[PDB]
Amino acid sequence: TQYPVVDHEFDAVVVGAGGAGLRAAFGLSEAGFNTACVTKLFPTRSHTVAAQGGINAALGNMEDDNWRWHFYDTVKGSDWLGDQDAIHYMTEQAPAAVIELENYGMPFSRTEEGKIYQRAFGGQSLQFGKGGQAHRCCCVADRTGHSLLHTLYGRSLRYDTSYFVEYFALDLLMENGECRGVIALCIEDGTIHRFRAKNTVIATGGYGRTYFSCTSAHTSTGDGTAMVTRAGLPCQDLEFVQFHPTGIYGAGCLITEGCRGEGGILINSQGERFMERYAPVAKDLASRDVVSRSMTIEIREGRGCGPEKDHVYLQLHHLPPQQLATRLPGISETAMIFAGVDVTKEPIPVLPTVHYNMGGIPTNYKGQVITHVNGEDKVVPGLYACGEAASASVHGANRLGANSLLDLVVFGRACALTIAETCKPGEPVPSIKPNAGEESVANLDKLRFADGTIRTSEARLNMQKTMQSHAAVFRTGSILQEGCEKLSQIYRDLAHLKTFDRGIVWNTDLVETLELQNLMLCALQTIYGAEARKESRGAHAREDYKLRIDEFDYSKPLQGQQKRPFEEHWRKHTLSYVDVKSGKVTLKYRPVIDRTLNEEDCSSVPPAIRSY
Amino acid sequence: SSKAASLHWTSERAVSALLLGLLPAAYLYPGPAVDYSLAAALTLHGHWGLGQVITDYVHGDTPIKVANTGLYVLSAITFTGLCYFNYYDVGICKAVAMLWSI
Amino acid sequence: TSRIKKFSIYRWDPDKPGDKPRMQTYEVDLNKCGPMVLDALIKIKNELDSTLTFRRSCREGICGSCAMNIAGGNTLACTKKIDPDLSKTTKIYPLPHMYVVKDLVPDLSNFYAQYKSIEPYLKKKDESKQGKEQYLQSIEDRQKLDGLYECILCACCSTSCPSYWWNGDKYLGPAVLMQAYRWMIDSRDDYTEERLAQLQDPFSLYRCHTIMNCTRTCPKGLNPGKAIAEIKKMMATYKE
Amino acid sequence: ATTAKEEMARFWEKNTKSSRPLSPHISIYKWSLPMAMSITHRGTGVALSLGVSLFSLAALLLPEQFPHYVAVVKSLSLSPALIYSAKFALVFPLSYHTWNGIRHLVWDMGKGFKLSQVEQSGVVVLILTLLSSAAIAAM
Ligand SMILES: Cc1cc2nc3c(=O)[nH]c(=O)nc-3n(C[C@H](O)[C@H](O)[C@H](O)COP(=O)(O)OP(=O)(O)OC[C@H]3O[C@@H](n4cnc5c(N)ncnc54)[C@H](O)[C@@H]3O)c2cc1C
Ligand SMILES: CCCCCCCCCCCO[C@@H]1O[C@H](CO)[C@@H](O[C@H]2O[C@H](CO)[C@@H](O)[C@H](O)[C@H]2O)[C@H](O)[C@H]1O
Ligand SMILES: COc1[nH]c(=O)c(C(=O)[C@@H](C)C[C@H](C)[C@@H](Cl)CCl)c(O)c1OC
Ligand SMILES: O=C([O-])CC(=O)C(=O)O
Ligand code: SF4
Ligand code: F3S
Ligand code: FES
Ligand SMILES: [K+]
């Protein structure tokens, strides 16, 4: 009524211009689909550009490799909470995915033979875990994501994709359980745009900004994750937040795990390479959930570095300076800017930092969003997801380093491949109601003319500080419940919000209020899923339930074991729902997919003990 | 020519190197050969130079056409007046010396 | 014991009918703020004036969003240290000679379009074996890309170039020109002569007169001025 | 869905007819020595060309030969200081433009592009211009 509404019609609409959204976008245009790409940022400003370490693939440039070993490391790294059918697809398609990127012009670092340089990375091995450290992390120095995103954006200029840059997606257009498209806000002129399409792909990244300190960008507010929540659909495994070991102290900027992959070690206050004690075999190259816990224990036990005993040191000055300039030029500059550290002389002050969300929108290995109805996986018609916004789940309870950038290009391509085989271009686009999505415009105008007691910035900090203390590396039911009561009160106090910018053209005050709404929807499902999960699996470490509870006890022989029913064990996905009006969180559980795509080609790995 | 812009860029630098070498030529070997070479180089280098200023600062179809035509008149008259001074008067080299004998 | 610092910021609101550009001053306590100018802009927006609009994201100088003119020079607000001299007021303007969408937010679409025009992607005369094997590139030919691929398209260099001020409609600018050179010397590219041929006009390339504002202002420490000089040398040497 | 040329056209069509202001540029940008020397190389070049053109026009329009006007100035019996100031003011823009022109030609070969070398070569041009102009005017 008050806002001018523009309508569009496409075969498919992709929400997100990161590494995952771009691959799906021109992949659909590759297949002749009239495809629109809606992104709140210019594509090369996406958080993918900040990625450093690299991207995994069993190319075999450094030694003889096997993608099935990569499969095994990923299944083990996920703590057997990941879907092995999706891990199969990702690890098998990894060589072709990276070769495609290099063929696009990605300026990978090179070996003596002219092939793609691959470095070691945390928790990756040869010979199914019995062959020592693997080197399959293909990288562009330590600016891999920068070159990945700029290569994908350049490649996307060749196709007929219709871009809508700096458009803020508000909600999905749901009718009869199907997705008809997305309604968005044009930031440049303040107009509401409804995009109608037969298929929608959600690649909106993570929501690391729910915490106070995080390596994520200010735009990682989980906007797509909240749209699925407001549509009455579930999110999966949101309580599994990855804490990167080496986030620089203070500014929280990331210091790449490639530092340890090239030879860097972690040092406590007494000069000890303490990872030789927590992981005698993997040492500083253990899984990220193990290292982040190891570093956190050393701090609270009194062996922290600095004048506050609140961090540790990442030592690189024992490495040759020519290697530091060739392999890690980015963090060399960053450590000087945000810490005054010369990596050739002094170590980098690092501490665990929120980095990545293993959870997100539940899909299958084809990229199709699924919901759980009476124990069966119902594919949501017309809805797709890929990247950090989605839960394949190829990462389960803990992601291996250099596997996200792979997730982006593998399942971005997979979404485009799945749409091409299921639908044809030019098929009649589905209709919508004349007032479809008006609840988004009403909620938008409500926040635009907010005149209450609490400002948006004040509410976002109370959420970030609550998540940082009540959902850190270690969690307890008594502390999680205190955070649940705080978050559920902050959400109900969003009615008292207060905005100032009464405009609509580039109203970052209004946009960052919508992002706070999205951050809060994700933060509730995170801390309530963490409070209910009474076990310790991967990143989620409960000190009141230090054990991992599977359907059996895989530490003892399965000979005549009483199988625990699904309602009693925990090797299962957490499915979270949220009543947006009241804020109450509902939790369900669906089984993990242990089967691969071909047992005779890739043996399914049963749960075992998880040590490094 | 499909390479007219790069060939012109090279010619600008070539005339500058030529004009640079005419300064020691005028001091060491003053006479008609250097006077007329200076006449041609000072006009051509100045003409191309003032053209870049017009390309940078003058916009619009007619103003650009008006400026480039008025510049062509200036250059042609300048080269002719310099040749007139070399043939009917003392010449460039000798005029500089007489001016410095003041 | 507070260290109050003054900032003078450009302000314009397109939604105010008849709004005129102006400057507004803010007092920031440096003892309760980060070290970078973006930390002050975010502190101002979160505490003093939430209408102050600007682009930001990575806050680590990798994405290129927060490019602006701080103390008279084009730089990234997230890697530019706040001047601790409390007797000097920091003046903050948007990128120079750009249309202003709101406050510090310029219109980069012509900048983006110029970048598209040079086709910034690998091109081969035979693209049939695309995606089969990895393209071989020696360490030496890969090293030639250092100083070029790191560009974050912040547009600081181009918006500091006077030639781009007067002829930005036809001069490609140092950012786009360096990216063109980045693809010209990529050993895996087969369209080097076509990329050079595109610049055979008086404006696309030859409006650069080696002013070198671009190299001085680059927050990544790159040298787009030197890259343009390598293009010019290639324009005068290649045969057809 | 839009080519690069089309995007550039809509940019100008959208902005020029809009109420959007143009962000300030020359009035707010901090100057430097290489930038000041770049525009000075342009002003000296233009001044030199116009000086040549006024000379050529004078050879075609004045009723007296050059030796006559030199004899008139000599008969004025000017002081050596004024003669020096005139000589210095005549030879300063030529000398600056020559040295900075060689500096430009070096750049065109691709040499001296490190920012610290740009500052060095500029200062060298500045002292070479002064030394050359001082010695020439003394003649
Ligand atoms: C500092 C850092 C370094 C990393 N390094 C590595 C690495 O070396 N290797 C690795 O494998 N992984 C790495 N990761 C993890 C990985 O890079 C990210 O998880 C991944 O890039 C996310 O990509 P994405 O395409 O899913 O979304 P992003 O790249 O985060 O982009 C999100 C996109 O969604 C769009 N969007 C969001 N909300 C909206 C809305 N409301 N309307 C419209 N559009 C919207 C935005 O425009 C944006 O373009 C790193 C992560 C970080 C933070
Ligand atoms: C005919 C003679 C030619 C014209 C002469 C004009 C003289 C004044 C020019 C303006 C000089 O203005 C001044 O230049 C110097 C040198 O680049 C600048 O210096 C700046 O860059 C240099 C390095 O490039 C840094 O070492 C220094 O810390 C920094 O402030 C300074 O920021 C600026 O304030
Ligand atoms: C060598 O070419 C050049 N070199 C320059 O330093 C330059 C400039 O620096 C400009 C900012 C000079 C500006 C036009 C002055 Cl006259 C306003 Cl007080 C400029 O405009 C230019 O032409 C494109
Ligand atoms: O998250 C990853 O996959 C890798 C990463 O951030 C790093 O380089 O440390
Ligand atoms: S060259 Fe430097 S200033 Fe210019 S766009 Fe690239 S990073 Fe930004
Ligand atoms: S400032 Fe501009 S004139 Fe050339 S050397 Fe840099 S692009
Ligand atoms: S925000 Fe990415 S560069 Fe400053
Ligand atoms: K995820």
JSON list of N, CA, C and O in Angstrom, two decimals, chain C residues 141-162:
[
{"chain": "C", "resi": 141, "resn": "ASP", "atom": "N", "xyz": [56.23, -18.49, -13.99]},
{"chain": "C", "resi": 141, "resn": "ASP", "atom": "CA", "xyz": [55.11, -17.80, -14.62]},
{"chain": "C", "resi": 141, "resn": "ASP", "atom": "C", "xyz": [54.01, -17.49, -13.62]},
{"chain": "C", "resi": 141, "resn": "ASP", "atom": "O", "xyz": [53.25, -16.53, -13.81]},
{"chain": "C", "resi": 142, "resn": "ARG", "atom": "N", "xyz": [53.89, -18.29, -12.55]},
{"chain": "C", "resi": 142, "resn": "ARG", "atom": "CA", "xyz": [52.95, -17.96, -11.48]},
{"chain": "C", "resi": 142, "resn": "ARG", "atom": "C", "xyz": [53.43, -16.76, -10.67]},
{"chain": "C", "resi": 142, "resn": "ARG", "atom": "O", "xyz": [52.62, -15.95, -10.22]},
{"chain": "C", "resi": 143, "resn": "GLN", "atom": "N", "xyz": [54.75, -16.62, -10.50]},
{"chain": "C", "resi": 143, "resn": "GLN", "atom": "CA", "xyz": [55.28, -15.50, -9.73]},
{"chain": "C", "resi": 143, "resn": "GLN", "atom": "C", "xyz": [54.96, -14.16, -10.39]},
{"chain": "C", "resi": 143, "resn": "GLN", "atom": "O", "xyz": [54.79, -13.15, -9.70]},
{"chain": "C", "resi": 144, "resn": "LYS", "atom": "N", "xyz": [54.86, -14.15, -11.73]},
{"chain": "C", "resi": 144, "resn": "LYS", "atom": "CA", "xyz": [54.53, -12.92, -12.44]},
{"chain": "C", "resi": 144, "resn": "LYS", "atom": "C", "xyz": [53.18, -12.34, -12.01]},
{"chain": "C", "resi": 144, "resn": "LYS", "atom": "O", "xyz": [52.92, -11.16, -12.26]},
{"chain": "C", "resi": 145, "resn": "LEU", "atom": "N", "xyz": [52.32, -13.14, -11.39]},
{"chain": "C", "resi": 145, "resn": "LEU", "atom": "CA", "xyz": [51.02, -12.68, -10.93]},
{"chain": "C", "resi": 145, "resn": "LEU", "atom": "C", "xyz": [51.06, -12.02, -9.56]},
{"chain": "C", "resi": 145, "resn": "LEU", "atom": "O", "xyz": [50.09, -11.35, -9.19]},
{"chain": "C", "resi": 146, "resn": "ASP", "atom": "N", "xyz": [52.14, -12.19, -8.80]},
{"chain": "C", "resi": 146, "resn": "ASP", "atom": "CA", "xyz": [52.26, -11.53, -7.51]},
{"chain": "C", "resi": 146, "resn": "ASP", "atom": "C", "xyz": [52.27, -10.02, -7.70]},
{"chain": "C", "resi": 146, "resn": "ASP", "atom": "O", "xyz": [52.93, -9.49, -8.60]},
{"chain": "C", "resi": 147, "resn": "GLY", "atom": "N", "xyz": [51.53, -9.32, -6.84]},
{"chain": "C", "resi": 147, "resn": "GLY", "atom": "CA", "xyz": [51.33, -7.89, -7.00]},
{"chain": "C", "resi": 147, "resn": "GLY", "atom": "C", "xyz": [50.17, -7.51, -7.88]},
{"chain": "C", "resi": 147, "resn": "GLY", "atom": "O", "xyz": [49.94, -6.31, -8.08]},
{"chain": "C", "resi": 148, "resn": "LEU", "atom": "N", "xyz": [49.43, -8.49, -8.41]},
{"chain": "C", "resi": 148, "resn": "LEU", "atom": "CA", "xyz": [48.34, -8.21, -9.34]},
{"chain": "C", "resi": 148, "resn": "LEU", "atom": "C", "xyz": [47.03, -8.84, -8.89]},
{"chain": "C", "resi": 148, "resn": "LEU", "atom": "O", "xyz": [46.00, -8.16, -8.81]},
{"chain": "C", "resi": 149, "resn": "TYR", "atom": "N", "xyz": [47.05, -10.15, -8.59]},
{"chain": "C", "resi": 149, "resn": "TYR", "atom": "CA", "xyz": [45.83, -10.84, -8.22]},
{"chain": "C", "resi": 149, "resn": "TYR", "atom": "C", "xyz": [45.32, -10.43, -6.85]},
{"chain": "C", "resi": 149, "resn": "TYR", "atom": "O", "xyz": [44.15, -10.67, -6.54]},
{"chain": "C", "resi": 150, "resn": "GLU", "atom": "N", "xyz": [46.17, -9.81, -6.02]},
{"chain": "C", "resi": 150, "resn": "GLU", "atom": "CA", "xyz": [45.77, -9.44, -4.66]},
{"chain": "C", "resi": 150, "resn": "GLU", "atom": "C", "xyz": [44.76, -8.31, -4.64]},
{"chain": "C", "resi": 150, "resn": "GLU", "atom": "O", "xyz": [44.22, -8.01, -3.56]},
{"chain": "C", "resi": 151, "resn": "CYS", "atom": "N", "xyz": [44.50, -7.66, -5.78]},
{"chain": "C", "resi": 151, "resn": "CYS", "atom": "CA", "xyz": [43.62, -6.51, -5.82]},
{"chain": "C", "resi": 151, "resn": "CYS", "atom": "C", "xyz": [42.23, -6.87, -5.30]},
{"chain": "C", "resi": 151, "resn": "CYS", "atom": "O", "xyz": [41.65, -7.88, -5.70]},
{"chain": "C", "resi": 152, "resn": "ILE", "atom": "N", "xyz": [41.70, -6.03, -4.41]},
{"chain": "C", "resi": 152, "resn": "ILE", "atom": "CA", "xyz": [40.42, -6.27, -3.77]},
{"chain": "C", "resi": 152, "resn": "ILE", "atom": "C", "xyz": [39.31, -5.42, -4.37]},
{"chain": "C", "resi": 152, "resn": "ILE", "atom": "O", "xyz": [38.19, -5.41, -3.84]},
{"chain": "C", "resi": 153, "resn": "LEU", "atom": "N", "xyz": [39.59, -4.70, -5.46]},
{"chain": "C", "resi": 153, "resn": "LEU", "atom": "CA", "xyz": [38.60, -3.87, -6.15]},
{"chain": "C", "resi": 153, "resn": "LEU", "atom": "C", "xyz": [37.94, -2.86, -5.20]},
{"chain": "C", "resi": 153, "resn": "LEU", "atom": "O", "xyz": [36.74, -2.59, -5.28]},
{"chain": "C", "resi": 154, "resn": "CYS", "atom": "N", "xyz": [38.74, -2.30, -4.29]},
{"chain": "C", "resi": 154, "resn": "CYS", "atom": "CA", "xyz": [38.23, -1.28, -3.38]},
{"chain": "C", "resi": 154, "resn": "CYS", "atom": "C", "xyz": [37.92, 0.03, -4.08]},
{"chain": "C", "resi": 154, "resn": "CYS", "atom": "O", "xyz": [37.13, 0.82, -3.56]},
{"chain": "C", "resi": 155, "resn": "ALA", "atom": "N", "xyz": [38.54, 0.28, -5.24]},
{"chain": "C", "resi": 155, "resn": "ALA", "atom": "CA", "xyz": [38.42, 1.49, -6.07]},
{"chain": "C", "resi": 155, "resn": "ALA", "atom": "C", "xyz": [39.12, 2.70, -5.47]},
{"chain": "C", "resi": 155, "resn": "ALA", "atom": "O", "xyz": [38.88, 3.83, -5.92]},
{"chain": "C", "resi": 156, "resn": "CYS", "atom": "N", "xyz": [40.01, 2.51, -4.48]},
{"chain": "C", "resi": 156, "resn": "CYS", "atom": "CA", "xyz": [40.74, 3.64, -3.92]},
{"chain": "C", "resi": 156, "resn": "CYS", "atom": "C", "xyz": [41.65, 4.28, -4.96]},
{"chain": "C", "resi": 156, "resn": "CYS", "atom": "O", "xyz": [41.74, 5.52, -5.04]},
{"chain": "C", "resi": 157, "resn": "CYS", "atom": "N", "xyz": [42.34, 3.46, -5.75]},
{"chain": "C", "resi": 157, "resn": "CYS", "atom": "CA", "xyz": [43.31, 3.99, -6.71]},
{"chain": "C", "resi": 157, "resn": "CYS", "atom": "C", "xyz": [42.62, 4.80, -7.80]},
{"chain": "C", "resi": 157, "resn": "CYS", "atom": "O", "xyz": [43.03, 5.93, -8.10]},
{"chain": "C", "resi": 158, "resn": "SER", "atom": "N", "xyz": [41.56, 4.25, -8.41]},
{"chain": "C", "resi": 158, "resn": "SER", "atom": "CA", "xyz": [40.90, 4.94, -9.51]},
{"chain": "C", "resi": 158, "resn": "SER", "atom": "C", "xyz": [40.26, 6.24, -9.06]},
{"chain": "C", "resi": 158, "resn": "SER", "atom": "O", "xyz": [40.32, 7.25, -9.77]},
{"chain": "C", "resi": 159, "resn": "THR", "atom": "N", "xyz": [39.65, 6.25, -7.88]},
{"chain": "C", "resi": 159, "resn": "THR", "atom": "CA", "xyz": [39.02, 7.46, -7.36]},
{"chain": "C", "resi": 159, "resn": "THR", "atom": "C", "xyz": [40.03, 8.48, -6.84]},
{"chain": "C", "resi": 159, "resn": "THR", "atom": "O", "xyz": [39.62, 9.56, -6.39]},
{"chain": "C", "resi": 160, "resn": "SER", "atom": "N", "xyz": [41.33, 8.17, -6.87]},
{"chain": "C", "resi": 160, "resn": "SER", "atom": "CA", "xyz": [42.37, 9.13, -6.54]},
{"chain": "C", "resi": 160, "resn": "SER", "atom": "C", "xyz": [43.08, 9.67, -7.77]},
{"chain": "C", "resi": 160, "resn": "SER", "atom": "O", "xyz": [43.91, 10.58, -7.64]},
{"chain": "C", "resi": 161, "resn": "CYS", "atom": "N", "xyz": [42.78, 9.15, -8.96]},
{"chain": "C", "resi": 161, "resn": "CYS", "atom": "CA", "xyz": [43.48, 9.52, -10.17]},
{"chain": "C", "resi": 161, "resn": "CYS", "atom": "C", "xyz": [42.79, 10.72, -10.81]},
{"chain": "C", "resi": 161, "resn": "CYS", "atom": "O", "xyz": [41.58, 10.66, -11.08]},
{"chain": "C", "resi": 162, "resn": "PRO", "atom": "N", "xyz": [43.50, 11.83, -11.06]},
{"chain": "C", "resi": 162, "resn": "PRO", "atom": "CA", "xyz": [42.85, 12.98, -11.70]},
{"chain": "C", "resi": 162, "resn": "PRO", "atom": "C", "xyz": [42.30, 12.67, -13.08]},
{"chain": "C", "resi": 162, "resn": "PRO", "atom": "O", "xyz": [41.24, 13.18, -13.45]}
]
